[model samples]
Target: HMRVGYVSTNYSLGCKADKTIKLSSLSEERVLKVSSSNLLCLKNILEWNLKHEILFFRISSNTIPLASHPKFHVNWKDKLSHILGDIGDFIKENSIRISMHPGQYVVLNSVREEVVRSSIMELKYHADLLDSMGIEGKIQIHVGSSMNGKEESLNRFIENFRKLPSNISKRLVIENDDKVFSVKDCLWISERTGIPVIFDNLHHSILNNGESLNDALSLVRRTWKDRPMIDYSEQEPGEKPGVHATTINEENFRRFVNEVDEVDIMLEVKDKEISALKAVKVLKELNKL
Candidate 1:
């Protein structure tokens, strides 16, 4: 069956409370309080997804406040171990797939050393969050900047990637960006690091090395050791090329579904789950699920 997913946040569930604290007012106590609430919210969201039959989700990076920052010092994993375990059990029991996408600032291939250091810390936090829950969910990231030229930056990414702990490296997957990196570029890195490449449809349409949709899908599929994940979104008409549409374009989505294989599809639309539900309906109509 075709499994469709959405990014963080569920508007229809009425669970839209901000579950993080500002850095200025951050403390160990405040972190625990906010993180506890965030975990509860995540549980509620997963329950809602279960009810709606949406089996895949991307967890927000802010689920734990300042999780990787130096100023915030809290053994949160130990403190919240029970809640995380409970959530992980629920996830495993339901066969739900979870993943995470760090923010744009997490550039592992940056020319500067400080940015790379902070980036590694942030990656470790994500790895720890998933491990604490006892889940082998994927963590997706880009190849980062090409400021010093593509060759140098990709090599730097490879160098830095080697330094990451085994736990982090095993869970990490790279995606092609809309501008800087292409699927071919990601496949090149994947060849070296054995890292899986996530095929982003919109990004490939914007910047690719002349690979067709089917060819690109086939190439990326060979890189994945598990069920592959695909990011799909349409261009918002009258807007810039990379802007995601406010909702799913039914015709376009149906056509795309017809071409895809048995990979999990993550809707990158602005309307989030609303679009995902529409995509589900389209999939149903196409008898994909």
Candidate 2:
């Protein structure tokens, strides 16, 4: 997937707590997320895309639960199928690898059985949606939550981790979060459970997981059962509240690589268009690809 670099978008921006801006405040979770991110932003990228052919255009996952609403259930499959068909056309034109963004509600590590079951359903539906789109191995997701305790949550995430129907395993890749949720814990869980790991540098740092990118990379090299997709974002303004891919400063970036020989870095940022372009630039400068 574009040599597995960074991305500048959120998987579920519509439902994310962070996306609760003053503008699109619906004040409730009853809205049906039938559409997607601005098509204008995507159309604009088509210009740069033609200029510089990309390796793969990772498709973000359905930000909202497709079945969360009765209206969504009606045409969710065909709706996404149409979207992916269009996206697939882009991938073919550019000879790019297609990837996806996942949502937050699929919390596998929830300490509660109910949460775990629902999370599994989320993953199952996610893979099912990809198959419907004729896309495979493009879904990316994060480790659910720490529940009450890290160990408690890890066990739940691993033991109760739901396998999607058929060959959907290749499409489901797990990520490491920061702070109360962490890459270290994710790494430990993966080592035991054999799940592919997605490591993030900034997340492990400022979140007080108190780990290094090198360690994160090492986890990829050692236990990851599949190609590693590492994520990177710069520390942002305090009020901004997230370390996003928008700020790709050379400072932490200098040390972001942990044996770049074999790793994928998914950029999670604010200005998705610009951030994606900059991510390729970063890889070019590093000569890692």
Evaluate all candidate structures by whole-model CA lDDT and list the values in order. Answer: 0.89, 0.55
Candidate 2: tens digits of C-alpha lDDT, residues 1-289: 2254334232323332112122243322322232334332343344344454335445444333344322334454564466546754665556455556556777766777776667666666667655665555556677677667777777766666544454555566676665566667666776776666666666666564554556557766676555566666776756454546445655455465524556656556565545556656666777764
Q: Which regions in candidate 2 have their CA more than 4 angstroms from the true location?
A: 1-50, 53-58, 63-65, 68-71, 76-83, 89-95, 162-168, 207-211, 237-242, 254-259
- What shift in Å separates residue 37 of candidate 2 from its native position after superposition? 9.1
Cα lDDT tens digits, model 1, 84-181, are: 99999999999999889997989988889999999999999999999999999999999999997999989999999998899999999999999888
Give per-model TM-scores: 0.97, 0.71
* Ten contiguous residues with the weakest lDDT in model 1: 13-22
* Residue 89 displacement in candidate 1 (angstroms): 0.5
What TM-score does candidate 2 reach? Answer: 0.71
lDDT over C-alpha atoms for residue 36 of model 2: 38
